[PDB]
Each structure stands twice: as structure tokens, then as C-alpha cells.
Amino acid sequence: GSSGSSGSPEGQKVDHCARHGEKLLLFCQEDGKVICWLCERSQEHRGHHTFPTSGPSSG
Ligand SMILES: [Zn+2]
Ligand SMILES: [Zn+2]
């Protein structure tokens, strides 16, 4: 698999998934919420099309 990109507790906690702990930068359409990497690749949001929120930004 993959160890991860950010693995430090001193990291800017921004919309961190309370389930996995990964930063939520994606936006699921089917659900209309913000999910993380693991989530997206999870049977929960599997196949679901998500978009990069990039914080306070429309496009
Ligand atoms: Zn998650
Ligand atoms: Zn979804």
C-alpha cells in the first residue's frame, strides 16, 4: 500500500476525517460531503465521484 504523505501530529489539523484522520480535500457528489483518500477508496464512497475542495474555493 502506501505509508502516507503527512504523518505528523504537529500538522495543521484542517477538516481531518474523524474516522481515518486524513485531511478532507475531496467533495463527494453522490453524498455531497467531504471525504478523505481512504474514504473515497472505501466501499462506502467507492466509485463515488469526488472533487478537490482546496479549502475556501469554488473552482
Ligand atoms: Zn475517512
Ligand atoms: Zn459518496
**Technique used:** NMR
**Ligand 1 center to 40 CA (angstroms):** 8
The C-alpha cell that represents 56 in the structure block: 475556501
What is the count of structural domains for the chain?
Answer: 1
Cα gap 41→13, rounded to integer Å: 21
Annotated binding residue 16: no
Full residue range of the structural domain in which residue 48 is found = 1-59
Cα gap 50→48, rounded to integer Å: 6
Question: Which residue's C-alpha cell is 500538522?
Answer: 11
**Ligand 2 center to 28 CA (angstroms):** 5
Which among 15, 16, 31, 27 is positioned nearest to 53, based on CA atoms? 27
**Ligand 2 center to 12 CA (angstroms):** 25
